[PDB]
Amino acid sequence: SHRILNLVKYDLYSIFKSPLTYLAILVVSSLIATQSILMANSMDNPKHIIVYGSVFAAAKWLLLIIGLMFVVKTITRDFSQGTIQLYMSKVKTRVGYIISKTISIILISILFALIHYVILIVVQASSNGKNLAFSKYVDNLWFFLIFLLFFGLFLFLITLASQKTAMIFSLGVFLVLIVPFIKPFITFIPRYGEKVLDAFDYIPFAYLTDKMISSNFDFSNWQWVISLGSIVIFFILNILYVAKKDI
Amino acid sequence: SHRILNLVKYDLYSIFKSPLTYLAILVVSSLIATQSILMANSMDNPKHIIVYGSVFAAAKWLLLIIGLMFVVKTITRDFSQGTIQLYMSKVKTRVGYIISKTISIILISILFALIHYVILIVVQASSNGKNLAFSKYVDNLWFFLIFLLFFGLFLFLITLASQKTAMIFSLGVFLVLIVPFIKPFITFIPRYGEKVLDAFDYIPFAYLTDKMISSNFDFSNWQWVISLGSIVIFFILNILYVAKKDI
Amino acid sequence: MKLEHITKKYGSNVVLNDIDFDFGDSRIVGLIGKNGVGKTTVMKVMNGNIIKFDGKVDIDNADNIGFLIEHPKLYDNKSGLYNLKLFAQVLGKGFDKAYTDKIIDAFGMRPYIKKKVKKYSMGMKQKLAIAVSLMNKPKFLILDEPTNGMDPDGSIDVLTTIKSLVNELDMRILISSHKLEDIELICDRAVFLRDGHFVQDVNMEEGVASDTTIVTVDHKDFDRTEKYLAEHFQLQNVDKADGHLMINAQKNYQVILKALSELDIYPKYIETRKSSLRDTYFNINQRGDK
Amino acid sequence: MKLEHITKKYGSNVVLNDIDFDFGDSRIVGLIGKNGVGKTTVMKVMNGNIIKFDGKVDIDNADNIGFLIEHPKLYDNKSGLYNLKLFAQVLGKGFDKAYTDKIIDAFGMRPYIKKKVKKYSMGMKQKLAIAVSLMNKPKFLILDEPTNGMDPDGSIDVLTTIKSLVNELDMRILISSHKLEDIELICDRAVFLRDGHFVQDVNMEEGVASDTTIVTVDHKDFDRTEKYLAEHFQLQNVDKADGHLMINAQKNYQVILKALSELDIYPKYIETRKSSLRDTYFNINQRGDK
DSSP states of D90-101: HTSS---HHHHH
Contact C253 D266 (CB under 8 A): yes
Beta partners for D273?
Answer: D212
Q: Please report residues of A whose CB lies closer than 8 A to that of C48.
A: 88-90
Reduce the secondary structure of C179-217 to three states and give it as a string: CHHHHCCCCCEEEEECCCCEEEEEECCCCCCCCEEEEEC
DSSP category for residue D14: E
Q: How many CB pairs under 8 A join C and D?
A: 76
Chain C CB contacts of A3 under 8 Å are 90-91
Phi, psi for residue B12 in degrees, rounded to 5:
-60, -40
A247 domain residue, yes or no? no
Query: DSSP class of residue D13?
Result: E
Name the DSSP class of A129.
S
Does residue D108 sit at the C interface (CB-CB below 8 Å)?
A: no
Q: Do C73 and A86 touch (CB under 8 A)?
A: yes
Q: Give dist(CA A126, CA A30) in Å, integer.
A: 14
- Closest of D133, D113, D117 to residue D64, by C-alpha: D133
* Residue B163 DSSP symbol: -
Of D193, D195, D145, the C-alpha closest to D33 is D193
Contact D271/C268, CB-based, under 8 Å?
no
- How far is residue D21's CA from residue D29's CA, in Å, rounded to a whole number? 11
Cα(B15)–Cα(B17) distance, rounded to whole angstroms? 5
- Alpha-carbon span A41 to A35, nearest angstrom: 10
**D69–B89 CB contact, under 8 Å:** no
Q: Is residue B247 in a domain?
A: no
In this structure, are strands D172-176 and D28-32 parallel, antiparallel, or unpaired? Answer: parallel
D144: DSSP letter? E
DSSP label at residue D67: E
After what residues is chain B interrupted, C–N > 2.5 A? none
Pairing of strands D140-144, D65-68: parallel
C51, C91, C93 member nearest A246 (Cβ): C51
As a whole number of angstroms, the distance between CA D126 and CA C148 comes to 14
Q: Which of B2, B83, B89 sits opposite D48 (nearest CB)?
A: B89
Nearest residue of A to residue C46, measured between CA atoms: A89
DSSP one-letter string for chain C = -EEEEE--EETTEE---SEEEE--S-SEEEEE--TTSSHHHHHHHHHT----SSSEEE--TT--EEEE-SS----SSSBHHHHHHHHHHHHSSS--HHHHHHHHHHHT-GGGSSSBGGG--HHHHHHHHHHHHHTT--SEEEES-TTTT--HHHHHHHHHHHHHHHHHTT-EEEE--S-HHHHTTS-SEEEEESSSSEEEEEE--STTTT-EEEEE--HHHHHHHHHHHHHHS---EEETTTTEEEEEP-S--HHHHHHHHHHT---SEEEEE---HHHHHHHHHSTTT-
- Nearest-Cα residue of chain D relative to residue C34: D151
Q: Is D54 exposed, middle or buried (0-12, 13-18, 19+ CB in 10 A)?
A: exposed
Give how far A235 is from chain C: nearest CA, Å. Answer: 21
Q: Is B42 helix (H, G, I), strand (E, B) or coil?
A: coil
| Letter string b/e over residues D38-50, b meaning 16 or more CB atoms within 10 A of that residue's CB | bbbbbbbbbbbbb
Domain boundaries, chain D: 1-290
- Please report all neighbours of C, defined by 3+ CB atom pairs within 8 A: A, D
Question: Rounded to whole angstroms, how far apart are CA atoms C110 and C104?
Answer: 7
Q: For C138, what's the count of Cα atoms within 13 Å in the CB-facing half-sphere? A: 23
Between CA C176 and CA C183 the distance in angstroms is 10
Distance from CA of B163 to the nearest CA of D (A): 16
Taking a C-beta distance cutoff of 8 angstroms, is the pair A159, A97 a contact? no
User: Residue B91's closest CA among C47, D128, A171, D53?
Assistant: D53
**A23 belongs to a structural domain:** yes
Domains in chain A, number: 1
Q: Can you tell me the distance from the alpha carbon of A120 to that of A29, in angstroms, rounded to the nearest whole number? A: 10
* β-bridge partners, C193: C198
Give dist(CA D267, CA C253) in Å, integer.
7
CA distance D116 to D76: 7
Rounded to a whole number of angstroms, the distance from the CA of A94 to the nearest CA of chain C is 11
- From D49, D51, D73, residue closest to B81, measured CB to CB: D73
Sheet holding D238-239, edge to edge: D238-239, D244-247, D212-216, D269-273
Distance CA D56, CA D58 (A): 7
Q: Which whole-number Å values give the CA distances from A54 to A59, A61, A97, in the listed order? A: 8, 11, 39
Give, as one character, the DSSP assignment of residue B45: -
H/E element holding D269? strand D269-273
Q: What residues have CB less than 8 Å from C192, skipping those under 6 apart?
A: C32, C33, C198, C199, C200, C201, C202, C280, C281, C284, C285
Method: cryo-EM
How distant is the Cα of C53 from the closest Cα of chain A, in angstroms?
9
Quickly count: other Cβ atoms within 10 Å of residue B22's Cβ: 10
CA distances from C129 to A169, C70, C138, D91, D210 (A): 30, 11, 14, 39, 43
Closest residue on chain B to D76 (Cα): B81
d(CA A242, CA B13): 44
Length of chain C: 290
For residue C27, CA distances in Å to C162, C170, C172, C185, D246 come to 12, 9, 5, 14, 43
For residue B10, the SS3 value is helix
* Residue C5 φ then ψ, to 5°: 55, 45
Q: How far is D184 from chain B (nearest CA, A)?
A: 29
Task: To the nearest 10°, report the CA torsion of C265, C271, C277, C278.
Answer: -50
- Phi and psi of C202, rounded to 5°? -90, 125
> Angle, to 10 degrees, between the axis of helix A166-186 and the axis of helix A53-81?
140
| CA–CA dist A210, A180 (Å, integer) | 7
Interface test with C, best of D31, D34, D35 (most C CBs within 10 A): D35
Which phi and psi (to 5°) does residue D172 adopt?
-115, 135
Host domain of residue B23: 2-242
Instruction: Say how far residue C117 (Cα) sits from the centre of its chain.
Output: 28
In chain B, residues with a C-beta closer than 8 Å to the C-beta of D61 are 92
Selecting from D49, D71, D74 the residue whose C-beta is nearest the C-beta of B89 gives D49
Q: Residue B23: phi, psi to the nearest 5?
A: -60, -45
Of B10, B86, B244, the CB nearest to D73: B86
Residues 6+ apart with CB under 8 A from C234: C248
Nearest CA in chain C to A87: C91
The pairing of beta strand D212-216 with beta strand D269-273: antiparallel
Nearest one of C59, C29, C58 to C171, comparing CA atoms: C29
Sheet hosting strand D28-32, strand order edge to edge: D65-68, D140-144, D172-176, D28-32, D189-194, D197-203
Contacting residues of D for C267, CB less than 8 Å apart: 253, 257
Subunit partners of chain D (3 or more CB pairs within 8 A):
B, C
CA separation for the pair A135, A149 (Å, rounded): 21
Spell out which residues of chain D touch residue B10, defining contact as CB-CB under 8 Å.
86, 89
Q: Which runs of consecutive H residues, i.e. helices, occur in chain B?
A: 2-17, 20-40, 52-81, 84-87, 91-126, 134-162, 166-186, 193-199, 204-210, 221-242
**Between chains, do B86 and D91 touch, taking CB under 8 Å as contact?**
yes
Q: With CB atoms and an 8 Å threshold, state whether C285 touches D153.
A: yes
CA dihedral C55, C56, C57, C59 (to 10 degrees): 150
Mutate to test the interface with C, among A1, A13, A83, A242 (most CBs of C within 10 A): A83
Closest CA to B59 of B106, B115, B103, B138: B115
State the distance between the two ends of chain D, measured CA to CA, in whole angstroms.
36
CA distance D271 to C213: 11
- Per DSSP, D119 falls in state G
The one-character DSSP state at A84 is G
The closest of D64, D85, D69 to D171, measured between CA atoms, is: D64
Distance from CA of D129 to the nearest CA of B (A): 11
Phi, psi angles (nearest 5°) of residue D16 = -120, 140
Q: What residues of chain C lie within 8 A of the CB of D145, using their CB? A: 149
| Cβ burial, residue A54 (10 Å; 0-12/13-18/19+) | middle
User: How many Å separate Cα B125 from the centre of its chain?
Assistant: 26
- Would residue B187 count as lying in a domain? yes
The shortest CB-CB distance from B247 to any of D49, D74, D86 is to D49
For residue A143, which of A102, A171, A115, A109 has the smallest C-alpha distance?
A109
